[PDB]
Amino acid sequence: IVTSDSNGLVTGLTHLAGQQVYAITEDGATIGSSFVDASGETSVKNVNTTLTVGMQYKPELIPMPLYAPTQMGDSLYAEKYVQDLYVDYVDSLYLQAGFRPQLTDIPNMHLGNYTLGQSVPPQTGIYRICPRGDWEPRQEFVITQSQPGPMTIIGVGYNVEVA
Amino acid sequence: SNIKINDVFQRIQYAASAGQTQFTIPFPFFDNEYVLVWQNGVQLVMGGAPGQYGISGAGSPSGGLITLVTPAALNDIITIQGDMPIDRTSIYSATISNLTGSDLNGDFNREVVMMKQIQTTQALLQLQYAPWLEVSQDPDVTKDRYLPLLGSGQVWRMNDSGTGIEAYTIDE
Amino acid sequence: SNIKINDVFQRIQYAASAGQTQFTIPFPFFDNEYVLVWQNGVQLVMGGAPGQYGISGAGSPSGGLITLVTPAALNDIITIQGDMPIDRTSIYSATISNLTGSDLNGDFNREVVMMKQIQTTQALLQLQYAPWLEVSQDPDVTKDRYLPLLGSGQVWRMNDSGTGIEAYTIDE
Amino acid sequence: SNIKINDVFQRIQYAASAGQTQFTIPFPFFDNEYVLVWQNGVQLVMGGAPGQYGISGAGSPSGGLITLVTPAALNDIITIQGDMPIDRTSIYSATISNLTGSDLNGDFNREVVMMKQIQTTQALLQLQYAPWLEVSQDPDVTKDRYLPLLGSGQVWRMNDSGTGIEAYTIDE
Amino acid sequence: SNIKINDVFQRIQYAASAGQTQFTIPFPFFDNEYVLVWQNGVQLVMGGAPGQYGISGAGSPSGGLITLVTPAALNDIITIQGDMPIDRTSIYSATISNLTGSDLNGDFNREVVMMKQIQTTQALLQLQYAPWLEVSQDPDVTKDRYLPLLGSGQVWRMNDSGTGIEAYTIDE
Amino acid sequence: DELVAAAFQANPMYMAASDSAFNQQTFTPRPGSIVPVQMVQGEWPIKPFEQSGNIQFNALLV
Amino acid sequence: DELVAAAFQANPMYMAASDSAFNQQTFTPRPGSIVPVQMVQGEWPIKPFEQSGNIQFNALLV
Amino acid sequence: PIRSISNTFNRGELDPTLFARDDLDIYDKGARKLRNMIALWTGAARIAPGTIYI
Amino acid sequence: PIRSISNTFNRGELDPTLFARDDLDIYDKGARKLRNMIALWTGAARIAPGTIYI
Amino acid sequence: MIELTSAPTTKIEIISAAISMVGKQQTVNTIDGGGALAIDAEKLYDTLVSAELGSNRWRFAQAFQQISIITTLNPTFDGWLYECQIPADCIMVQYLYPNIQYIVFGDKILTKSNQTFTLIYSRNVPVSKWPPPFSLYIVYHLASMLGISVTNSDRMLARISQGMEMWESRALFADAQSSVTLPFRHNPYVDVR
Amino acid sequence: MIELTSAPTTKIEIISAAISMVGKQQTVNTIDGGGALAIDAEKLYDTLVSAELGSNRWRFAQAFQQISIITTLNPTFDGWLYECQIPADCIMVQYLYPNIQYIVFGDKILTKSNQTFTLIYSRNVPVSKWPPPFSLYIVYHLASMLGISVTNSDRMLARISQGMEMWESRALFADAQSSVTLPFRHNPYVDVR
Amino acid sequence: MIELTSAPTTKIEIISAAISMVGKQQTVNTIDGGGALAIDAEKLYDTLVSAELGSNRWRFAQAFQQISIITTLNPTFDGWLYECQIPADCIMVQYLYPNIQYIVFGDKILTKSNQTFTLIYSRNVPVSKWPPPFSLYIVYHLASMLGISVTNSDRMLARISQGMEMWESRALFADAQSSVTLPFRHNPYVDVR
């Protein structure tokens, strides 16, 4: 826990010297990243603010291969295409999901019902995405996070064209 | 819902037919005062008296209409130009501003119109070198760019050394 | 558009080496159709036929590439300029919807690039008085700034009264 | 950043009184380095040594103040102009969960000041045809608009055919 | 209708401020079509065209709102009056069925509003003798209360016998 | 009425979504010629203009 | 109008997606000849140019 | 045709040698990768706890 | 097509992280919210007992 | 006094009726928080209405205005002399008065004369100007697009389609039948005389 | 204030509406913010729009340009004498003025004459110049292309395709009816006189 | 200034559009790691395009060149005297100028005369020379082959088939309509006179 001055300068981070760190406000909003120099100082966006500063560890969730048995058989090796991908989340921020390399960010800000300066609380809901993946039976979809924050994934759904 | 900007210049000029009063404003504008009208090089005044004009369509996404009080003569030249102040006096609060899609659309729309008005002047009314000419790529080299003030009976002439443009008296 | 827009002129010009095909684009661009290429004053076309070029690097901060199909001759002049039409690149719903920083970044970055293209033409390809000259600070005083149309064989010459620039027929 | 941007030209010029040191900046500016000061056509340096100046008021909507170290002589010409770079180096995250009023106002105000600087140059320091003149409304018609490079002792002159402006040598 | 009906006249009149658009409806109403609006004696129409109005607040105890599309001029008279047709707004089965207090409230509230509209016209727009005057308490005595139809140029005048009101022609 | 009717009933005319069904400028009326024609435009095919009326009725009263 | 009409109603003409349905340069109009023809191009078959109008009506007024 | 399927994560990360074992009841209850996350005893997967410098 | 389904409340209020667990036999026996009520052992939900001031 | 119509008079009432048709309760004052149905209805309303009024001569949507010759623009083909600006609110060109030679070419109108020309055209008009049959047709058609975009129900699309086509014909008949049918401008076998 | 309704004027409005019409709820305020679906939709948009304007005479997409650089064809065939480059912005050659002999051959126009002529052609135009019926037709057509891979139901895709064909006919009619039909330029039984 | 086309200009952009049509995201600069879809698309592209341009007279794909008599080869049958070499880039022989007696026999052209002959023929041309309608037709046709080779989905093949055949006709019309139809070279009842 640190406090920035009127210029956003933060000192006393010697144990993080040379590292890339993120800053999280007390309201629970991640405001960005910066490098700590060799002397333990870094500059953050918010000035005159109490912040938590630390290093990102990136969560990654790759579900099991698509399993959609049909009347023909198990179809474990059949060509499959995912038309829709449902991400089911609780109390989460900064999510992104899809088929690599082009992922889709999951928004967490309601235009028309947001007051500037406030931190939107961790969000709950279902988001539907067209991943635009290939037709391989072992294709991979990824749920991950763009910047540090709360994250809970309660399930992943699909609409699969099973050829 | 967006306004007509792409390939729509903020200036138009017409050759009137005998007895015409209605002239289209083909570009969007936000306020009546931000539209300039000339007739044969003389700027008109909005009003109801003869020689004045009425205006409608402010806030429309596509444009409006200019209605002359006095019917025009054949081959009168009517020029309509958008001239909006480049400023921003409506701003968001630091504490109690609720961000809306209408707010964002409004702010981007007026900045796009401002930018289009600047580019309209640059494209139709100003001079420039052809983009492929071998001008100096350093803006600090002002040989071909900077102009001097012209005194009476003087033209712009590159000097004999080819180092700058200077005013040059030519007798009449 | 989660890139940063650097302060780089939206125009670059090269003198080709013998057989050169690759030329770097130092400024950002977002679409291939919005980058113009000239070779010795003749605009080229994208494609794979001889005399055409390929382009890569759209959406990148910098470091795009132009690859000529036909290798250039020594001292061929290659000009690369950004030309993106002014337009809205977003729409926002009036009802409660979603917003991302990617949406805002795309809108602001593209408007910054559009402004830079206007200012690149102004700085490198246009004439201006030196900023310190004693021009009239009221734009309604058009003595030094309004030009007339030039007829055949005519130049711009300040009149003998020093009240405005008029077209003047040159003689021997 | 939670300030208004007024409609004020981004350039001011003064004729100094005897011994005057303080000159007002009537236009907003966000950083001291983005202001250029000239005294009798010589660019000054910000500092505390004689022949230099100090500047204050960055970020205020009403502009700031220029304080010369050495008092100016009578009728010294002082020119102050804003010169902010056109770029965008601070961007939002992909999925922001906190968008401050200062950040959003900053992005909109910053582009307004950029456009005002471009428009101030073209309104006060550049040439243009009168808005009502019958210039070709197709920008591809470059007869009156494209200039050639001037060689030594040359002027711009519309050719005998009236099809374009060409460089013409005068040795008088 | 689980609201309460307050004792408020079913008519309100305003003198508009310069450019006013919003006018409050202090009395309850149930349907938008049952509220009449006049401006300077001319009835308006609901809609979004110029010269029309929008209305909100149906089913609310009070605090409805009339929003003019065209802003009113100074001292324009805006009149708002409730006009709901007298009708049965419910139907009950003879067979054993269900009943709720919402059904009863809707019936009695609408019948109270209908009575208030009748009494509002009687109290604000109609003539009557003062309650304490010595009028005949038998309505079959019509001397003071029954009027004749008026012909051209005629007035109501009690006859010389004091037995009834008759039409009287008035000369020069 | 017969003269008005004959202009679009006796003459060979066509109905379509658009008169762009073929190119009038390059139309080549020659024996054996193939005319490029957009034979279907959206929901509607190009067809002869509908015949209507009772020509014999009019030339029985006249 | 009859002369204009006859040029494309009396003459044998065809409608197709393209005039490349057969090769006009190698077309061999001989008894027993087989002409290579793209009988269907995309969705549209090649067909006779559609007859329209009421020729008799025009030559009853004349 | 189109089939609708779902996947929860109460069995954690599964070894790649299990990917043909559709007979087991774990095929829709596991993950190919579960990194810097934990499996709650519901089906959900939560980001792993952070650390505080001492 | 139209499907006819029903739901009882034997398991009370269920945590939101269970809402993808259709494999469990509790999905049609619980409630998203059960506030100021109790679950009888027959599966019905009854309003909670009131209180008497002492 | 005049009795106010109970038919829809604002675009919000058109939208809320379409949302109710596909089964969701909706009030005009809570349209902002209408979720996916309100998001799509608002986005698709303008495109649907403009397309409809821009592809058919609806009498209630007609308008006229003088057109203007644009200086310095000269066509070089087929004898055309002038390029004329189309009105700003024009959504579908119908014809010119007086009927002389003209064509629509690009976004201009080409003429061979510099006399005063008036254009007859379609335009967007507010809902308060719509005939009630046309309003119900728009409600059905918009609901049909809400079925595709939101409900994803083939059953819903089948149920809405019959009503949508029926009210299109009825709205067209109601608009057309009020006035006489105008004659052709060109009648060659009579004009030649 | 005034109730305003207007047609799309930007590429983003077309693409975001098309994504709604394939029944996908993910937010597309910008192509950059729209994820993998938006970029694929933009890629197919570029191919579709030019293909559509390049295969039919839309009045709003017509343009003209004088051709003057006409050079000798040597060696040659069929009696052609000169060739000229088809301009790069020409997307479909329609006809030439005046009525000179010519053929489109490769990427050239071959002629037997050397004089300057005018080319009438089709060109790509921005959304701000599109008629509203055309805009809705493109929305459905683009949705039909995306729906090949992402639409769940065959019946739903057929419904989208039906909407594409319906608005194609209405857009074609609205474009065509504004002007008279031009006559054939070749009339042999009359020209022979 | 010339507006740059947004339609595809390279074979990689054609291929990536076809890959996106069958559902996969694809960038031009990552086409090398495109997996099975990219493997099949690049293998089948050259065969499909060459067969398409080699089976029909497309105006944009036409070319001409003089042919050459080959020494020491004597046809010896039907009165043919010389065997001539077909051009290297020739993909479909169309006709000869001047139109004299000739036949295509084997991979040669047999003639009875030693004058200068010019062959009119089809050839492969780069994508930047393609009309936009033809490009979209190739995208559909290539995507159809990707459905067979990769997706193994009967549903996908059914959905692509309608667009593939529609854009074949539209591309053919757009190519053909720009020029007049040429007359027959042989007219025996007239020539005999």
mmCIF file of all heavy atoms in Angstrom, chain C residues 33-57:
data_model
loop_
_atom_site.group_PDB
_atom_site.id
_atom_site.type_symbol
_atom_site.label_atom_id
_atom_site.label_comp_id
_atom_site.label_asym_id
_atom_site.label_seq_id
_atom_site.Cartn_x
_atom_site.Cartn_y
_atom_site.Cartn_z
ATOM 1 N N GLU C 33 -6.467 1.514 -48.077
ATOM 2 C CA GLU C 33 -6.973 2.434 -49.086
ATOM 3 C C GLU C 33 -6.726 3.892 -48.740
ATOM 4 O O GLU C 33 -6.923 4.754 -49.600
ATOM 5 C CB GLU C 33 -8.471 2.222 -49.295
ATOM 6 C CG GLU C 33 -8.937 0.812 -49.036
ATOM 7 C CD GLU C 33 -9.376 0.602 -47.605
ATOM 8 O OE1 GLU C 33 -10.204 1.396 -47.119
ATOM 9 O OE2 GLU C 33 -8.891 -0.352 -46.967
ATOM 10 N N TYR C 34 -6.316 4.194 -47.511
ATOM 11 C CA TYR C 34 -6.124 5.566 -47.072
ATOM 12 C C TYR C 34 -4.655 5.962 -47.035
ATOM 13 O O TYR C 34 -4.283 6.867 -46.285
ATOM 14 C CB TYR C 34 -6.775 5.770 -45.705
ATOM 15 C CG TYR C 34 -8.266 5.520 -45.707
ATOM 16 C CD1 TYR C 34 -8.919 5.092 -44.564
ATOM 17 C CD2 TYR C 34 -9.015 5.706 -46.858
ATOM 18 C CE1 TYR C 34 -10.276 4.863 -44.566
ATOM 19 C CE2 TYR C 34 -10.369 5.478 -46.869
ATOM 20 C CZ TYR C 34 -10.996 5.058 -45.721
ATOM 21 O OH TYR C 34 -12.349 4.828 -45.733
ATOM 22 N N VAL C 35 -3.816 5.298 -47.824
ATOM 23 C CA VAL C 35 -2.409 5.650 -47.970
ATOM 24 C C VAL C 35 -2.118 5.800 -49.454
ATOM 25 O O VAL C 35 -2.243 4.834 -50.213
ATOM 26 C CB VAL C 35 -1.480 4.600 -47.343
ATOM 27 C CG1 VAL C 35 -0.039 4.947 -47.626
ATOM 28 C CG2 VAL C 35 -1.720 4.510 -45.853
ATOM 29 N N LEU C 36 -1.719 6.996 -49.863
ATOM 30 C CA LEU C 36 -1.453 7.301 -51.260
ATOM 31 C C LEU C 36 0.036 7.188 -51.550
ATOM 32 O O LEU C 36 0.870 7.609 -50.746
ATOM 33 C CB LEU C 36 -1.947 8.703 -51.607
ATOM 34 C CG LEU C 36 -3.417 8.957 -51.283
ATOM 35 C CD1 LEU C 36 -3.757 10.413 -51.476
ATOM 36 C CD2 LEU C 36 -4.313 8.083 -52.134
ATOM 37 N N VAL C 37 0.364 6.612 -52.702
ATOM 38 C CA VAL C 37 1.743 6.414 -53.126
ATOM 39 C C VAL C 37 1.918 7.013 -54.512
ATOM 40 O O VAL C 37 1.121 6.741 -55.414
ATOM 41 C CB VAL C 37 2.134 4.925 -53.135
ATOM 42 C CG1 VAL C 37 3.562 4.761 -53.600
ATOM 43 C CG2 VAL C 37 1.948 4.317 -51.766
ATOM 44 N N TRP C 38 2.951 7.831 -54.677
ATOM 45 C CA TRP C 38 3.346 8.364 -55.970
ATOM 46 C C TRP C 38 4.763 7.917 -56.287
ATOM 47 O O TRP C 38 5.589 7.739 -55.391
ATOM 48 C CB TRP C 38 3.292 9.893 -56.007
ATOM 49 C CG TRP C 38 1.933 10.491 -55.878
ATOM 50 C CD1 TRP C 38 1.081 10.813 -56.887
ATOM 51 C CD2 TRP C 38 1.280 10.869 -54.667
ATOM 52 N NE1 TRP C 38 -0.068 11.357 -56.381
ATOM 53 C CE2 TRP C 38 0.029 11.400 -55.017
ATOM 54 C CE3 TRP C 38 1.629 10.800 -53.318
ATOM 55 C CZ2 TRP C 38 -0.871 11.864 -54.070
ATOM 56 C CZ3 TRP C 38 0.733 11.259 -52.382
ATOM 57 C CH2 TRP C 38 -0.502 11.784 -52.760
ATOM 58 N N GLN C 39 5.036 7.736 -57.573
ATOM 59 C CA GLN C 39 6.383 7.467 -58.062
ATOM 60 C C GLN C 39 6.649 8.425 -59.211
ATOM 61 O O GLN C 39 6.036 8.304 -60.276
ATOM 62 C CB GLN C 39 6.540 6.015 -58.507
ATOM 63 C CG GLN C 39 7.899 5.703 -59.093
ATOM 64 C CD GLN C 39 8.126 4.222 -59.284
ATOM 65 O OE1 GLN C 39 7.183 3.441 -59.351
ATOM 66 N NE2 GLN C 39 9.386 3.825 -59.371
ATOM 67 N N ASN C 40 7.555 9.375 -58.991
ATOM 68 C CA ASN C 40 7.859 10.422 -59.964
ATOM 69 C C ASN C 40 6.601 11.187 -60.366
ATOM 70 O O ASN C 40 6.412 11.548 -61.527
ATOM 71 C CB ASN C 40 8.565 9.845 -61.191
ATOM 72 C CG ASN C 40 9.905 9.234 -60.854
ATOM 73 O OD1 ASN C 40 10.639 9.749 -60.016
ATOM 74 N ND2 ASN C 40 10.232 8.131 -61.505
ATOM 75 N N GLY C 41 5.730 11.435 -59.395
ATOM 76 C CA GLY C 41 4.548 12.231 -59.635
ATOM 77 C C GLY C 41 3.371 11.499 -60.235
ATOM 78 O O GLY C 41 2.385 12.147 -60.596
ATOM 79 N N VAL C 42 3.437 10.178 -60.355
ATOM 80 C CA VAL C 42 2.351 9.372 -60.903
ATOM 81 C C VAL C 42 1.839 8.466 -59.796
ATOM 82 O O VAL C 42 2.606 7.685 -59.223
ATOM 83 C CB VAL C 42 2.808 8.550 -62.117
ATOM 84 C CG1 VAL C 42 1.667 7.701 -62.643
ATOM 85 C CG2 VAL C 42 3.336 9.469 -63.199
ATOM 86 N N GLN C 43 0.547 8.562 -59.499
ATOM 87 C CA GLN C 43 -0.018 7.775 -58.414
ATOM 88 C C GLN C 43 -0.093 6.306 -58.805
ATOM 89 O O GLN C 43 -0.544 5.965 -59.900
ATOM 90 C CB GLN C 43 -1.404 8.289 -58.040
ATOM 91 C CG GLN C 43 -1.960 7.638 -56.788
ATOM 92 C CD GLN C 43 -3.388 8.030 -56.500
ATOM 93 O OE1 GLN C 43 -3.962 8.871 -57.182
ATOM 94 N NE2 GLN C 43 -3.972 7.414 -55.486
ATOM 95 N N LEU C 44 0.337 5.439 -57.899
ATOM 96 C CA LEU C 44 0.319 4.005 -58.120
ATOM 97 C C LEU C 44 -0.964 3.390 -57.570
ATOM 98 O O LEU C 44 -1.735 4.025 -56.851
ATOM 99 C CB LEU C 44 1.536 3.349 -57.474
ATOM 100 C CG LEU C 44 2.913 3.827 -57.926
ATOM 101 C CD1 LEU C 44 3.998 2.961 -57.318
ATOM 102 C CD2 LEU C 44 3.002 3.827 -59.435
ATOM 103 N N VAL C 45 -1.176 2.123 -57.908
ATOM 104 C CA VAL C 45 -2.354 1.367 -57.506
ATOM 105 C C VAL C 45 -1.896 0.119 -56.766
ATOM 106 O O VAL C 45 -0.850 -0.451 -57.088
ATOM 107 C CB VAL C 45 -3.220 1.003 -58.731
ATOM 108 C CG1 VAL C 45 -4.411 0.174 -58.328
ATOM 109 C CG2 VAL C 45 -3.675 2.261 -59.439
ATOM 110 N N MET C 46 -2.657 -0.288 -55.755
ATOM 111 C CA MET C 46 -2.367 -1.534 -55.060
ATOM 112 C C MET C 46 -2.650 -2.728 -55.960
ATOM 113 O O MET C 46 -3.603 -2.723 -56.742
ATOM 114 C CB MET C 46 -3.200 -1.644 -53.787
ATOM 115 C CG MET C 46 -2.890 -0.602 -52.744
ATOM 116 S SD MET C 46 -3.880 -0.813 -51.261
ATOM 117 C CE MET C 46 -5.513 -0.515 -51.916
ATOM 118 N N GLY C 47 -1.826 -3.758 -55.844
ATOM 119 C CA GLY C 47 -2.042 -4.967 -56.609
ATOM 120 C C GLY C 47 -0.752 -5.738 -56.801
ATOM 121 O O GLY C 47 0.271 -5.440 -56.192
ATOM 122 N N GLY C 48 -0.834 -6.740 -57.674
ATOM 123 C CA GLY C 48 0.282 -7.624 -57.939
ATOM 124 C C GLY C 48 0.821 -7.539 -59.352
ATOM 125 O O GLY C 48 1.802 -8.206 -59.683
ATOM 126 N N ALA C 49 0.188 -6.731 -60.195
ATOM 127 C CA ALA C 49 0.668 -6.523 -61.549
ATOM 128 C C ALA C 49 1.912 -5.639 -61.543
ATOM 129 O O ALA C 49 2.152 -4.902 -60.588
ATOM 130 C CB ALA C 49 -0.423 -5.885 -62.403
ATOM 131 N N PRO C 50 2.731 -5.707 -62.593
ATOM 132 C CA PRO C 50 3.882 -4.801 -62.679
ATOM 133 C C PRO C 50 3.441 -3.345 -62.693
ATOM 134 O O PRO C 50 2.420 -2.990 -63.284
ATOM 135 C CB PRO C 50 4.557 -5.204 -63.994
ATOM 136 C CG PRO C 50 3.535 -5.985 -64.738
ATOM 137 C CD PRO C 50 2.710 -6.667 -63.706
ATOM 138 N N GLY C 51 4.222 -2.500 -62.027
ATOM 139 C CA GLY C 51 3.875 -1.109 -61.852
ATOM 140 C C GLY C 51 2.982 -0.814 -60.667
ATOM 141 O O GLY C 51 2.633 0.351 -60.452
ATOM 142 N N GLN C 52 2.611 -1.822 -59.892
ATOM 143 C CA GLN C 52 1.746 -1.677 -58.733
ATOM 144 C C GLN C 52 2.554 -1.917 -57.461
ATOM 145 O O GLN C 52 3.772 -2.088 -57.497
ATOM 146 C CB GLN C 52 0.553 -2.627 -58.850
ATOM 147 C CG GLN C 52 -0.333 -2.316 -60.045
ATOM 148 C CD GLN C 52 -1.504 -3.258 -60.181
ATOM 149 O OE1 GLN C 52 -1.450 -4.394 -59.730
ATOM 150 N NE2 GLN C 52 -2.570 -2.790 -60.810
ATOM 151 N N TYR C 53 1.869 -1.915 -56.320
ATOM 152 C CA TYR C 53 2.556 -2.086 -55.049
ATOM 153 C C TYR C 53 1.674 -2.846 -54.071
ATOM 154 O O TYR C 53 0.454 -2.911 -54.222
ATOM 155 C CB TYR C 53 2.968 -0.740 -54.440
ATOM 156 C CG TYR C 53 1.814 0.114 -53.971
ATOM 157 C CD1 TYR C 53 1.378 0.067 -52.657
ATOM 158 C CD2 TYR C 53 1.171 0.976 -54.839
ATOM 159 C CE1 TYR C 53 0.329 0.840 -52.230
ATOM 160 C CE2 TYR C 53 0.126 1.753 -54.420
ATOM 161 C CZ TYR C 53 -0.291 1.683 -53.116
ATOM 162 O OH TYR C 53 -1.336 2.462 -52.700
ATOM 163 N N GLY C 54 2.319 -3.424 -53.064
ATOM 164 C CA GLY C 54 1.628 -3.994 -51.928
ATOM 165 C C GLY C 54 1.898 -3.180 -50.680
ATOM 166 O O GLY C 54 2.904 -2.473 -50.609
ATOM 167 N N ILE C 55 1.013 -3.253 -49.695
ATOM 168 C CA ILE C 55 1.142 -2.463 -48.478
ATOM 169 C C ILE C 55 0.789 -3.338 -47.285
ATOM 170 O O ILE C 55 -0.122 -4.167 -47.358
ATOM 171 C CB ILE C 55 0.252 -1.204 -48.528
ATOM 172 C CG1 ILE C 55 0.298 -0.449 -47.202
ATOM 173 C CG2 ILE C 55 -1.173 -1.571 -48.884
ATOM 174 C CD1 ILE C 55 -0.389 0.878 -47.243
ATOM 175 N N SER C 56 1.525 -3.165 -46.192
ATOM 176 C CA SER C 56 1.222 -3.839 -44.941
ATOM 177 C C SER C 56 1.449 -2.877 -43.786
ATOM 178 O O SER C 56 2.108 -1.846 -43.930
ATOM 179 C CB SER C 56 2.073 -5.096 -44.754
ATOM 180 O OG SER C 56 3.449 -4.775 -44.708
ATOM 181 N N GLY C 57 0.884 -3.224 -42.635
ATOM 182 C CA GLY C 57 1.079 -2.467 -41.420
ATOM 183 C C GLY C 57 -0.114 -1.684 -40.920
ATOM 184 O O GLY C 57 0.054 -0.851 -40.025
#
